[PDB]
Structure formats: C-alpha cells, structure tokens
C-alpha cells in the first residue's frame, strides 16, 4: 500500500547478505532501496536500489535525492514507508541500528509534492 517494489521482488538472501556483508566489510554504508510511492508524482530519479553511506541522516538521504529530479525550487521530496514519514534529519545509520532494521538492508520509498502535475507532453 505504501511502497511497491521489493514486495513484488523478494530476495532476502541478497538483502540480508549484502547487509551484513557490508556492516562486516567496513564501509557500513546504508543500503537504500528508493521506490516510487502509490500516490507518487515525482518521476525522474533513478530510484531502484543503491548502497548509500551511513555517515548521513534521513533528510540527508533526501538531500541525496537533492530534489533536483525535475523538482521545483521551493518544493522538495518526501519519503513514505510503511505509511510513515521519517525524521528526515535523524540518522539513517543509528536509526538503521536503533529503530528500523530488517537484516541490515534499508528499504525506502520516495514521493514528491506539488512538483509535476499540471501539463504533460
């Protein structure tokens, strides 16, 4: 209902392994799986999945998306997961190991705001 991707393509072995493999490896980079929300209207960003360092926060991950993906000036991005709205400033890292975790891999879903929805080509 909230996100849509991994639920269609399950592969814990991959998530679990890559998760513990990285935390054991050294980089300790936050595995972020960006996915388009159901009511998402912010298309352009190559979401899919990619490992992002834990040396940053939630809003930093947002800063990663940097709302430069055909986004508007005064506007920005917004993430929804499991019907939530992360602290966007906390710390995807600590957070990853303090509240939200499934194995070590982090799954997120992006969504925009009053970005694009007027006239399409």
Coordinates of C-alpha atoms in Angstrom, one line a residue, residues 45-112:
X45 CA 15.0 9.9 -10.2
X46 CA 16.8 6.6 -10.9
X47 CA 15.4 5.0 -7.7
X48 CA 15.8 1.3 -7.9
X49 CA 18.4 0.3 -5.3
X50 CA 21.9 1.5 -4.3
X51 CA 24.1 1.4 -1.2
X52 CA 24.5 4.9 0.4
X53 CA 26.9 5.6 3.3
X54 CA 25.5 5.6 6.8
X55 CA 27.6 8.7 7.5
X56 CA 24.4 10.7 6.9
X57 CA 20.8 11.2 8.1
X58 CA 17.3 10.7 6.7
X59 CA 16.9 14.2 5.5
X60 CA 20.4 13.8 4.2
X61 CA 19.2 10.9 2.1
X62 CA 16.6 13.4 0.9
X63 CA 19.4 15.8 0.3
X64 CA 20.9 12.9 -1.7
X65 CA 17.8 12.8 -3.9
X66 CA 18.5 16.6 -3.6
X67 CA 15.1 17.3 -5.1
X68 CA 16.9 18.2 -8.3
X69 CA 15.0 15.5 -10.2
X70 CA 12.7 17.8 -12.2
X71 CA 11.6 19.1 -8.8
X72 CA 10.5 22.7 -8.2
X73 CA 12.5 25.4 -6.4
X74 CA 10.6 25.9 -3.2
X75 CA 9.5 22.3 -3.3
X76 CA 11.3 19.1 -2.2
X77 CA 11.0 15.4 -1.9
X78 CA 9.2 13.3 0.8
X79 CA 9.6 9.7 1.8
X80 CA 6.9 7.3 2.8
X81 CA 7.4 3.8 4.0
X82 CA 5.1 1.5 5.9
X83 CA 2.8 4.6 5.9
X84 CA 5.4 6.8 7.7
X85 CA 7.3 10.0 7.4
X86 CA 10.9 9.5 8.7
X87 CA 12.6 12.2 10.8
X88 CA 14.4 13.5 7.7
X89 CA 17.3 14.7 9.9
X90 CA 17.8 11.9 12.4
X91 CA 20.4 9.5 11.2
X92 CA 19.6 6.7 8.7
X93 CA 22.6 4.9 10.4
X94 CA 21.9 5.0 14.1
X95 CA 18.3 4.7 13.1
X96 CA 19.1 1.7 10.9
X97 CA 20.5 0.0 14.0
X98 CA 18.3 1.7 16.6
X99 CA 14.7 1.5 15.4
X100 CA 14.4 0.5 11.7
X101 CA 16.0 -2.7 10.6
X102 CA 15.1 -5.9 8.8
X103 CA 18.5 -7.5 8.4
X104 CA 20.8 -4.6 7.6
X105 CA 19.3 -3.5 4.3
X106 CA 17.2 -0.3 4.3
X107 CA 14.1 0.0 2.1
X108 CA 12.6 3.3 1.3
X109 CA 10.0 4.8 -1.0
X110 CA 10.2 8.3 -2.4
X111 CA 7.4 10.7 -3.2
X112 CA 7.2 14.4 -4.3

